[PDB]
């Protein structure tokens, strides 16, 4: 009661590097999806990699 802990919107903190991991993941996903259409990989591989 003396401390009065509370949770806020800004209090929720994300790991400094998230914009990098998600960005490289979606970049790799794009490169794959391009190549799939060219015949360099097959669907099972696409499914798995994703």
């Amino acid at each position: 009661t003396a401390t009065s802990i509370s949770l806020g919107i800004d209090d929720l903190l994300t790991i400094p590097s998230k914009g990098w991991l998600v960005q490289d993941a979606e970049q790799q996903s794009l490169i794959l999806e391009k190549h799939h259409h060219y015949g360099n990989v097959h669907a099972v591989e696409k499914l798995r990699q994703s």
Binding site: H35, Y38, G39, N40, V41, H42
Partner: protein, 87 residues
């Protein structure tokens, strides 16, 4: 039926023809690599060659090893395989 008979039937009715199907390096490696297995070491010579040919410098060195111009390799890519008829 037999494979030969089937191919004959196809040529006669459907119109099958074994075209050249010029491929990219990334694809040639895919066609010559999925025949062995997965995450397994490449033992076939053509598979190792296709794996090494994924680098531009390796190709530009192999084209000079045999003494061919830059346009000669591109012309040899679009080459008709199989038995060629007599003139």
């Amino acid at each position: 039926e037999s494979e030969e008979e089937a191919r004959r039937k196809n040529w006669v009715d459907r119109g099958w023809a074994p075209w050249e199907e010029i491929l990219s390096p990334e694809a040639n490696f895919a066609r010559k690599s999925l025949n062995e297995g997965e995450e397994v070491a490449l033992q076939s010579p053509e598979a190792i060659e296709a794996f090494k040919m994924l680098s531009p410098n390796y190709r530009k060195k192999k084209i000079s090893d045999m003494g061919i111009t830059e346009d000669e390799y591109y012309a040899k890519q679009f080459e008709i395989k199989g038995e060629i008829p007599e003139p």
